[PDB]
Amino acid sequence: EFPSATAKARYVRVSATKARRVIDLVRGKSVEEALDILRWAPQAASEPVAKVIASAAANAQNNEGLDPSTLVVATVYADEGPTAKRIRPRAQGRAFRIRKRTSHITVIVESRPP
Template identity: 65%
Template sequence: MEARAQARFVRVTPQKARRVVDLIRGLPASEAQAVLQFAPQAASEPIYKVLSSAMANAEHNFKLDRELLVVSRAWVDEGPTLKRFRPRAQGRAYRINKRTSHITVIVEARPEGQGRPKGRTR
């Protein structure tokens, strides 16, 4: 049984958020929370919130034990881009793209004997 949580329109670039999501994919959920708490990247805070929400969904909706949860899948999609202009010299203006992200985390219960999913080499 798997539970999911999603945060949409998060004001962090998808490229930076994917770096953080790659750290937790395949980890036990409690270990992933510890990794996110001490990760220096700014994207780790919204990803931590999404992971906590997915864990709460699993516990509340499916009565799953928090200790058995594993981050089975996690990904970041690109949201809409906010376009802003920065004044430059001699009347010019450069466009600044403020990118947004859609962060999705799926956790599932695994028996205690199983750790990471097969196929992961790192």
């Protein structure tokens, strides 16, 4: 098995599916190419995911003392966080429901040989 380190961003105020759309672009890629892809990705959900990946890479480099050049984004996914309920008043007196969803993003980077 390979050495690894993980980071987690909980209660990120983005919907889970929108975060997954961005996440599906950086599965199995190295940390640097994933960071560039998220930097040039035209989605607002890319900033939190890039922050999580950078935090995981820093955790791997610092606490375990792993070489950042060998880091690879092995496991990454976004779950569902607590959602808050709002009300949008509508025509003819009816009230509809609005869901303000959040998400948790988990990233596991690991050191792989060149």
